[PDB]
A paper describes a structure:
We report the atomic structure of RIP2CARD filaments, solved by high-resolution cryo-electron microscopy (cryo-EM), which reveals the molecular interactions underlying its assembly. Negative-stain and cryo-EM micrographs of samples prepared under the same conditions show that RIP2CARD filaments with bound NOD2CARDSs are shorter, straighter and have a lower tendency to aggregate than RIP2CARD filaments without [name]. Therefore, the hetero-[name] filaments were used for cryo-EM data collection and analysis. Indexing of the power spectra and symmetry refinement revealed a left-handed helix of 3.56 subunits/turn with an axial rise of 4.848 Å/subunit. The final cryo-EM map at 3.94 Å resolution shows that the filament has an approximate outer diameter of ~75 Å with a central solvent channel of ~25 Å diameter. The crystal structure of RIP2CARD can be unambiguously fitted into the cryo-EM density, with both N- and C-terminal ends orientated towards the outside of the filament. Manual adjustment using the clear density for the α-helices and the larger side chains such as tryptophan and arginine, followed by real space refinement, led to a final atomic model which comprises RIP2CARD residues P433 to Q518. RIP2CARD assembles into a helical arrangement using the conventional type I, II and III interfaces. The cryo-EM structure reveals that the type I and type III interfaces are polar, mediated by interactions of R488 and R444 (type Ia surface) with N457 and D461 (type Ib), and by contacts between E472 and E475 (type IIIa surface) and R483, R488 and T484 (type IIIb). The type II interaction is more hydrophobic for instance involving C455 and M470.
Numbering used by the authors:
A (entry chain D), B (entry chain A), C (entry chain E), D (entry chain H), E (entry chain B), F (entry chain I), ...: 433 to 518
The structure:
Amino acid sequence: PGIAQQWIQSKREDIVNQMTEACLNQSLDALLSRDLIMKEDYELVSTKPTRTSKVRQLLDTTDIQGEEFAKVIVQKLKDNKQMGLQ
Amino acid sequence: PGIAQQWIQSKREDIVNQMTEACLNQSLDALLSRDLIMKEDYELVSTKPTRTSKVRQLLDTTDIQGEEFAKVIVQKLKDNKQMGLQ
Amino acid sequence: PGIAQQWIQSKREDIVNQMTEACLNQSLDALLSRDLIMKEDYELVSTKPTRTSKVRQLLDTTDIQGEEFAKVIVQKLKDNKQMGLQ
Amino acid sequence: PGIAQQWIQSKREDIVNQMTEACLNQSLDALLSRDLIMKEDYELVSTKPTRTSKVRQLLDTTDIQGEEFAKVIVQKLKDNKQMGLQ
Amino acid sequence: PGIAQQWIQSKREDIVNQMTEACLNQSLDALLSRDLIMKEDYELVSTKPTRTSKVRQLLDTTDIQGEEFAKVIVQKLKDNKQMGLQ
Amino acid sequence: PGIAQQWIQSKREDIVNQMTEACLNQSLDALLSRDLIMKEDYELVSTKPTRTSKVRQLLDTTDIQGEEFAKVIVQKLKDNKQMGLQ
Amino acid sequence: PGIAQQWIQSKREDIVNQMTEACLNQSLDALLSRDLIMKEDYELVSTKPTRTSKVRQLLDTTDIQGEEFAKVIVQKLKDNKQMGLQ
Amino acid sequence: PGIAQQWIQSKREDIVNQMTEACLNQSLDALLSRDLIMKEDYELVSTKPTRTSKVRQLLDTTDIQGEEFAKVIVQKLKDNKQMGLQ
Amino acid sequence: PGIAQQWIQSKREDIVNQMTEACLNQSLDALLSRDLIMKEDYELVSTKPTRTSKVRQLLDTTDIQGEEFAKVIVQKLKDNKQMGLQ
Amino acid sequence: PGIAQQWIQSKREDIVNQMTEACLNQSLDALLSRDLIMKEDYELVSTKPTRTSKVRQLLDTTDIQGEEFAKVIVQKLKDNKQMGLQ
């Protein structure tokens, strides 16, 4: 389940066609800052040639990683003036 | 039987060679928005290397899942200007 | 089958090595003008590094999308002084 | 969908071959004025060697960013005496 | 048996490591020109990640499809200055 | 194949290191005179920083565009006292 | 793990939007001075068209190369008056 | 077992996240120099989209190929100033 | 096997880090002069962003194309004062 | 490796910010005197708008070209009263 994952599964159809590739990559590179994502799934989500799987290979990784994963991907998506829901 | 499944079995031969892979994936990722499909059959239908089973592994999953499953896969196939039958 | 698709499958070997990448992109970006192609298969056909799949990932998308799709890709290929067959 | 995006997808084929590179850049640099676009997709849209992708890498970024993004790119395209539609 | 298939099974070990992927794809896309191959095995042979099965998934498809299939795959392999045997 | 393209593929190695950048540009700008090349591949061939791709991005564009394209690029290369072969 | 890599993964989100492209290139060309980086990954990190991957294709290369790699990339980032943390 | 394979299975977890993709490819292309690896598993290990399987599809190929295979992959990993163990 | 391919597989590790990108392109464009390479693998080897695959996507194409292919790529590498072995 | 290249990789960080653009160009034009560099990489290194890549696009070309290349670029850098190391 998860408390940080109350919303990213709820608006996954929102966050696939609204989170741009740099707002993807300003956060996904930030996931390697706390050693909080792994250091070899990064070149599996970045190596996707299209962006529609470059965002979703993160978006199922955040479905499987813990709530301590998604609690830091969310304010990196609220600091961008995109849309606001916690 | 089903009321939402009155049509997807009726035009399964239509929907295999007319529903493209992104119109597949704009709806199949939307199935995880309501927690309405599961979170581990998704990487079983997306991991199909060809598209002719990437669409049909959804299309038998919607044959087995309920009418509350297929009632939301249908207007995600009517909003796309493809073909119209309810 | 299709009536607009009477010709693009007929001369697919013609249209792969004769439709240039800008005549590709002057029409493929025009497919997003009527909301007539999707908004996330576009960065799957444009992200192809070579042009020989940058044209064909459209050319099978127009094999799977309807005749209302291919009826607008054809006069965008007849306004260019390339070759004329409807 | 979007209300500010009622028009930029509607006339994307217009705005690719009519919005010049400085009317591109007088607005795209203005997107960094409100911290309203990101500060590392800017050198991804400006680094495109041709102009036909220097305008469109903005034009799909405005397809994915919100209506608060496109509501400020539009009067920066109406103050220029080019063409008028809201 | 087959008369057009007198040679492609005879030099299958030749044609796997000598027919390059574009000479593969200049002919395999040409197989969809006469509606002569199907329109959903194409994205099963192209979706092979390696080329050593991207050529052979055609090369067993031409073992199972008729002599009217292989009679058109052969001069698309003789027009290329590669090797000549009918 | 082509009848006007009997020679430009035949002497492409000649025409890359013998057609200078202004004899490139006196003809490539002349291709926009008949609306005979497109109006957004022009700033893709001119934006090449080196001349060795500024000539060849035309020279593969004339490999893909028709014989009505190459039949007008040839006497713009025979009026210049460079070399004569039709 | 690494002792020189105690910090570059720690402030990777810092070093992506603060290390400029010449402070990138004054150090990345200096990595070829000791034969300490390879001589064919250099034109893979420099060939990135945007700077946001021109810095990060080094920044994951320093995640995978040893602590003898990152111990020389760090004082080339402390001699520049940018920010100081070892 | 093997004598050259005394170490690559011993530090496979080391060599997956420390051997970079060009130090992968400076050696894996060198394996085709002695005709010592095959000429159609090369485009099966290079076609892996991520690097974490682009290195390991070599790293199990060197688990199955002989000690004459691994005795030449090792000094191509000791000439690089990475880490030293025979 | 091949007689012209006695050497290019023998010194592939030489020819990857010694054949520069213009000595690549002065020969690879010359391969389209005799209609001797194809006209749609050219924009697959040139579209490689790095040079280390821009040379090798030719160097495996010459591993798969015939000895009549490699017999003309070799004196285009001996006329350049680089290194001499037939 | 190379014997003439014992030093230019050793002091590449020296030679990037110490070899001025005319001492670049008095030697790089001299490389076309013996037909010793090519005649179409010259307008790829000179067309670099900045000098920091106008010197380095030579400085990796001399990393890939032979020791007969670098043995003549060195005394053209020792005749200038700049710094002396062979």
